[PDB]
Amino acid sequence: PFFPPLYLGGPEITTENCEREPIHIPGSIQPHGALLTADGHSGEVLQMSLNAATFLGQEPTVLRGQTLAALLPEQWPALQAALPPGCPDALQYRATLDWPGHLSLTVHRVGELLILEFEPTEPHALRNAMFALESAPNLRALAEVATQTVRELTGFDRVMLYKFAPDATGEVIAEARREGLHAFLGHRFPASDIPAQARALYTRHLLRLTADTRAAAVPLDPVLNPQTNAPTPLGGAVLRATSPMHMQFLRNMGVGSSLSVSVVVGGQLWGLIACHHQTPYVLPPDLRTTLEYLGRLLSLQVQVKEAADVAAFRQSLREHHARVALAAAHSLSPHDTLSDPALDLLGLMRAGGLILRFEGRWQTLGEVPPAPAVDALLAWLETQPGALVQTDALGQLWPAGADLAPSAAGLLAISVGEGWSECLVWLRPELRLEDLGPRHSFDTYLEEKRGYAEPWHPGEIEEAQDLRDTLTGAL
Amino acid sequence: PFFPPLYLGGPEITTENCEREPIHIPGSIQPHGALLTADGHSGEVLQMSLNAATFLGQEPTVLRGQTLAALLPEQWPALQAALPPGCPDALQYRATLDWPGHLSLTVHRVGELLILEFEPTETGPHALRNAMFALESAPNLRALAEVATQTVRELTGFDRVMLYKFAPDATGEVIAEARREGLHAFLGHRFPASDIPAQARALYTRHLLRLTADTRAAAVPLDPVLNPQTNAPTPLGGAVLRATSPMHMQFLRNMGVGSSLSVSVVVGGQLWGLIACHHQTPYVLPPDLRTTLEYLGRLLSLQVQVKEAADVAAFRQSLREHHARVALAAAHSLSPHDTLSDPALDLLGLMRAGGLILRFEGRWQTLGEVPPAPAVDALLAWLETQPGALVQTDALGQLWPAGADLAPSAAGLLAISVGEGWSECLVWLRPELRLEVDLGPRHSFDTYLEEKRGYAEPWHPGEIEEAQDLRDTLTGAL
Ligand SMILES: *C/C=C1/C(=C/c2[nH]c(/C=C3[NH+]=C(/C=C4\NC(=O)C(C=C)=C4C)C(C)=C\3CCC(=O)O)c(CCC(=O)O)c2C)NC(=O)[C@H]1C
Ligand SMILES: *C/C=C1/C(=C/c2[nH]c(/C=C3[NH+]=C(/C=C4\NC(=O)C(C=C)=C4C)C(C)=C\3CCC(=O)O)c(CCC(=O)O)c2C)NC(=O)[C@H]1C
Numbered sequence: 001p002f003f004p005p006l007y008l009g010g011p012e013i014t015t016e017n018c019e020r021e022p023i024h025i026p027g028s029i030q031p032h033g034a035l036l037t038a039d040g041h042s043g044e045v046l047q048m049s050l051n052a053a054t055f056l057g058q059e060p061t062v063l064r065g066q067t068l069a070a071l072l073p074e075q076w077p078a079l080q081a082a083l084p085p086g087c088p089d090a091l092q093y094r095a096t097l098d099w100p101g102h103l104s105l106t107v108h109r110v111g112e113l114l115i116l117e118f119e120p121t122e123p124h125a126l127r128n129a130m131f132a133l134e135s136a137p138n139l140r141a142l143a144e145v146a147t148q149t150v151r152e153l154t155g156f157d158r159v160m161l162y163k164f165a166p167d168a169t170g171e172v173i174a175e176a177r178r179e180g181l182h183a184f185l186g187h188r189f190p191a192s193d194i195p196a197q198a199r200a201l202y203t204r205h206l207l208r209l210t211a212d213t214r215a216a217a218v219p220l221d222p223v224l225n226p227q228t229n230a231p232t233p234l235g236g237a238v239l240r241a242t243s244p245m246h247m248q249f250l251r252n253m254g255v256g257s258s259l260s261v262s263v264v265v266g267g268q269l270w271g272l273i274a275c276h277h278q279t280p281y282v283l284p285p286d287l288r289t290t291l292e293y294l295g296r297l298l299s300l301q302v303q304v305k306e307a308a309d310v311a312a313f314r315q316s317l318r319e320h321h322a323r324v325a326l327a328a329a330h331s332l333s334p335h336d337t338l339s340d341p342a343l344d345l346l347g348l349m350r351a352g353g354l355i356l357r358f359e360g361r362w363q364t365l366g367e368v369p370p371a372p373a374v375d376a377l378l379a380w381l382e383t384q385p386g387a388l389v390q391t392d393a394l395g396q397l398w399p400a401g402a403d404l405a406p407s408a409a410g411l412l413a414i415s416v417g418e419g420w421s422e423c424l425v426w427l428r429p430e431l432r433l434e435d436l437g438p439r440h441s442f443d444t445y446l447e448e449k450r451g452y453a454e455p456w457h458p459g460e461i462e463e464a465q466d467l468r469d470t471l472t473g474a475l
Numbered sequence: 476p477f478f479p480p481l482y483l484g485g486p487e488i489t490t491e492n493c494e495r496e497p498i499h500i501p502g503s504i505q506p507h508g509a510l511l512t513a514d515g516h517s518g519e520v521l522q523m524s525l526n527a528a529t530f531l532g533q534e535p536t537v538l539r540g541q542t543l544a545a546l547l548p549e550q551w552p553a554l555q556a557a558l559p560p561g562c563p564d565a566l567q568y569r570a571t572l573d574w575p576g577h578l579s580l581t582v583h584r585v586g587e588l589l590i591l592e593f594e595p596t597e598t599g600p601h602a603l604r605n606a607m608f609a610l611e612s613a614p615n616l617r618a619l620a621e622v623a624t625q626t627v628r629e630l631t632g633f634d635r636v637m638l639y640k641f642a643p644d645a646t647g648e649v650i651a652e653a654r655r656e657g658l659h660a661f662l663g664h665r666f667p668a669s670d671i672p673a674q675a676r677a678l679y680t681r682h683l684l685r686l687t688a689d690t691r692a693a694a695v696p697l698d699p700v701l702n703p704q705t706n707a708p709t710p711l712g713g714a715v716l717r718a719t720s721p722m723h724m725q726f727l728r729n730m731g732v733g734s735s736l737s738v739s740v741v742v743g744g745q746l747w748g749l750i751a752c753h754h755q756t757p758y759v760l761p762p763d764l765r766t767t768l769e770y771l772g773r774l775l776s777l778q779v780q781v782k783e784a785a786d787v788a789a790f791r792q793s794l795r796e797h798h799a800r801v802a803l804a805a806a807h808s809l810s811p812h813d814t815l816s817d818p819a820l821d822l823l824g825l826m827r828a829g830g831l832i833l834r835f836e837g838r839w840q841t842l843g844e845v846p847p848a849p850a851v852d853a854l855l856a857w858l859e860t861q862p863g864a865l866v867q868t869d870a871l872g873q874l875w876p877a878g879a880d881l882a883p884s885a886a887g888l889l890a891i892s893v894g895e896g897w898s899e900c901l902v903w904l905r906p907e908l909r910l911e912v913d914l915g916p917r918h919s920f921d922t923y924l925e926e927k928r929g930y931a932e933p934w935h936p937g938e939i940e941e942a943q944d945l946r947d948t949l950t951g952a953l
Contacts, residue, residue, distance in 0.1 A: 082605065091612035094601040124569040127766050128557065130773070135566035267781070289604050293770060296607070300777045304744070 002197070005231060007223050013245045015436065019195045023243045024235035027224075028217035030210070032282045033119040033239045035220065036063070037232060040085055040112050043068035043076055046226045049218045055118055057100050060221075068114075072097070075105060083109040089236045090204060094285070096121060104285040110233050113225060117239045121285050125153055126293060133294075133301045142305045143174035146298050150273055151176040153290055154283060156259070158276040160184055164269060166455070169445060170194065173271075181278075188433060190445045193249075201235050203269045206262035206295050207288065210242040212280035213250045213257065217241040238288075250276075252437040257281035259288075261295035265303045273298065314459040320348050321467055328474040334358040338424070339365055345424070348467075349460050353408050353427030360421070368427060369404040377401060381413060382420040388465050389413040395451035402451065405430045410453025412461065414468035417475065424471070426464075428453040477674070480708060482700050488722045490914060494672045498720045499712035502701075503694035505687070507759045508594035508716045510697065511538070512709060515560055515587050518543035518551055521703045524695045530593055532575050535698075543589075547572070550580060558584040564713045565681060569762070571596060579762040585710050588702060592716045596762050602630055603767050610771075610778045619782045620651035623775050627750055628653040630767055631760060633736070635753040637661055641746060643933070646923060647671065650748075658755075663910065667923045670726075678712050680746045683739035683772050684765065687719040689757035690727045690734065694718040715765075727753075729915035734758035736765075738772035742780045750775070791937040797825050798945055805952040811835040815901070816842055822901070825945075826938050830885050830904030837898070845904060846881040854878060858890060859897040865943050866890040872929035879929065882907045887931025889939065891946035894953065901949070903942075905931040 004010035410428035479485035887905035
């Protein structure tokens with residue numbers, strides 16, 4: 001449930017309440033440009049940023065209450081045609097203006113209200129890059145080209161590709177940075193660090209920046225909309241003031257400027273091309289457009305490459321599965337055959353541990369909890385219904401196995417025969433990796449993942465239940 | 476199975492054998508630009524188009540056997556780095572050159588051989604950005620397609636821009652059109668599998684752009700025609716400048732099309748369709764502008780998928796409401812026949828059908844346009860022969876030979892048995908397909924309708940699924 005903004009008696013945005021901050025309505029913009037609001041039908045200017053007077057070369061009451069018909073005689077008709085009444089806030093029209101200098105007009109309609117962003121403005125890298133992304137072999141190499149290309153175009157100090165995991169937590173899957181900067185490659189950060197409110201907004205509008213992290217915001221006058229005495233939804237405005245709670249996060253990293261392009265796959269915020277500069281840095285509108293193209297070109301290509309990887313992954317697993325089933329038919333001893341490192345039942349499910357259980361007894365393979373602990377676990381496994389069991393934290397699902405986290409935090413089991421006398425049981429180790437900020441957010445991520453293992457890829461869980469069925473036939 | 480090309484004693488490309496034409500190897504290019512081939516490792520120039528001598532300002536033996544290291548001193552290193560050995564033919568590098576004028580260098584590697592396309596180069600500003608957002612904020616596939624054809628026409632200034640959508644059976648349809656005032660409309664017309672051969676489809680899935688800048692211009696062969704590396708024909712498949720098939724050039728000339736262009740719309744490794752473009756006079760799109768089309772080609776390739784799947788979602792959502800409104804009256808049922816014949820329920824409109832046979836309580840009724848009295852008896856007698864609860868077809872005339880005569884009233888079929896066995900059953904029926912307005916457009920439209928003899932509109936899978944849901948619901952109405 002949202003809070004009111006700071007300008008409507010709303011509360012302090014602390015670190016404990018920040019998931020409720022109304023970030024779509026700061027009623028203020030960044031000072032590198034200027035903002036007007038106007039009535040959708042009449043084109044009557046209603047609101048205005050304080051600096052807008054100066055950005056344009058007209059006096060602060062002369063602009064207010066004026067028509068866009070008069071102000072933008074050439075643009076106003078074509079503008080209005082480009083944005084129908086009732087069309088979505090996602091739809092943006094851009095044109096350039098020739099003024100006393102060159103200005104980049106960016107427009108979008110939030111129903112009744114038109115919003116107008118002004119910024120100052122004036123070869124084949126993108127085309128070559130598009131083809132590079134397409135002819136990349138896998139998601140990792142795709143991500144590398146993405147971060148690399150974005151850095152070559154912008155000249156940012158750091159360009160990460162931040163990938164969201166199923167549990168809303170993030171990971172830097174790729175990085176392209178300046179020589180002599182500390183690497184975030186591989187680091188992971190919690191759900192908390194990018195709130196749901198921001199995620200949801202980043203799914204609608206696929207670009208936002210923070211041109212200077214220490215610059216003061218420029219409020220709107222009036223702050224509230226004369227139409228509806230309601231706060232002006234700047235959610236889909238580039239110039240929107242960035243959250244002060246997040247600006248602080250960036251300042252504590254020594255980030256002078258920020259930028260992030262949303263990578264959206266099938267109406268789902270898959271990730272961000274996240275960018276940092278160590279000094280303030282305003283990307284030109286003409287160049288940001290290039291990023292937005294990549295943002296969508298990547299949004300396609302992620303999906304194509306990622307699904308093609310998952311395909312080739314399970315294809316490895318079918319071959320591995322069928323090589324087990326080969327030796328499982330020609331079986332001298334059920335335990336001997338599966339313990340065999342040539343078969344590698346650990347490597348099929350990529351596991352730190354494994355319990356083979358057959359003929360009224362059990363063996364281990366690899367790193368596994370102590371002798372009595374396994375007996376307790378196998379005793380517990382019989383309690384479960386169905387042929388297949390699964391978890392990313394057996395410590396939770398089974399409280400008495402909290403102590404067994406280090407050797408076996410994550411679990412994937414299957415019963416060979418029905419009932420758990422004869423069964424295979426994969427086990428994975430507890431996960432581990434290498435005040436406000438990323439030092440703390442990395443630590444607090446690992447704190448969120450206490451007694452948590454790497455989760456099981458669905459292809460592994462499916463192939464497990466295939467192997468479950470195959471090994472019943474080995475009897 | 477491919478034929479050899481015309482330059483290796485290969486046969487005449489007739490209209491009956493053309494699905495075998497080796498269109499990836501014409502060993503010739505269009506004269507609006509020039510082409511070099513070079514060795515991948517050494518950069519040694521191997522092949523050359525005849526006009527290349529003149530396009531560059533160097534003599535026809537001076538260029539041959541020369542290094543690219545010498546010829547393109549600044550580009551050759553960056554070029555070579557951009558295209559690794561063993562990288563795919565899809566990957567293209569572009570740069571501009573400053574020569575005695577401006578040239579547009581386009582490069583791609585086919586394994587051992589580098590291929591280099593030269594075109595002359597040097598409006599508009601935010602048209603693409605605005606257009607990208609327009610495509611995104613379009614409400615449906617139809618409106619998306621309209622913005623696409625419209626935008627492409629605004630950028631290029633083509634005489635006609637169609638969006639040609641492939642159907643499941645490889646046949647095409649012009650789902651949208653943006654054309655010049657005073658030109659004959661192809662909007663709605665459909666064309667067979669034959670008119671875009673499998674060889675071309677497959678090539679158009681790999682490389683997402685090809686043109687025909689002048690339909691009556693002569694091709695410019697390569698010298699040597701065969702590759703000095705492997706005495707093998709030079710695979711120009713992924714070259715813009717590749718000579719268009721003469722069999723297709725004839726198709727365009729018989730439409731009065733002077734220039735052509737088409738961008739592939741690929742969805743999930745599948746050739747979904749083409750943004751097809753025509754100009755009535757010859758017209759060479761600038762490289763810098765074609766790039767813009769290629770962006771749209773991919774921006775659309777995403778957006779098609781998003782809009783098309785979101786339409787299919789909202790479609791089946793209509794069908795759940797319709798289904799549940801039937802199941803409402805099916806529980807509160809005075810008479811099984813009376814309730815379903817009711818036009819308020821509209822069992823025709825659920826499956827969008829020209830006919831319907833209601834069969835219950837040892838007898839049958841019709842609704843809408845349906846074959847004669849004895850014909851239905853023969854059909855229902857036949858329906859009992861089929862296994863499973865559900866039956867389906869786009870041509871019952873084929874599946875059931877004795878119902879060939881029944882095509883006009885009922886060419887397409889979707890049936891379901893209420894109880895198990897076909898005593899009690901619902902049977903939707905669709906009319907034979909038809910539409911309104913010796914090689915070209917108006918033969919290919921006629922020959923399409925000839926391919927669709929005794930064929931109805933096919934059943935959308937959402938309709939077939941909802942049919943089998945309704946099948947289960949109406950068993951519970953007993
Ligand atoms: C209690 C709330 C917190 C909070 C709020 C917050 N964060 C954002 C937006 C972003 N946060 C990002 C997080 C990271 N950037 C990094 O570089 C790394 C690690 C290497 C992390 C984890 C990112 C990338 C964004 C997007 C914007 C950008 O690229 O700068 C918002 C929304 C901002 C806006 O647009 O108005 C908010 C409200 N962040 C916290 O850490 C806690 C305190
Ligand atoms: C027996 C073989 C035939 C044949 C060969 C052929 N066709 C193409 C490429 C295209 N054919 C297209 C068909 C149409 N264009 C239209 O405007 C309409 C109707 C309104 C149709 C049905 C199209 C669009 C293409 C793509 C290229 C373009 O836009 O011009 C090829 C491949 C050409 C190449 O790139 O080398 C071939 C071999 N076409 C026939 O009709 C029969 C005779």
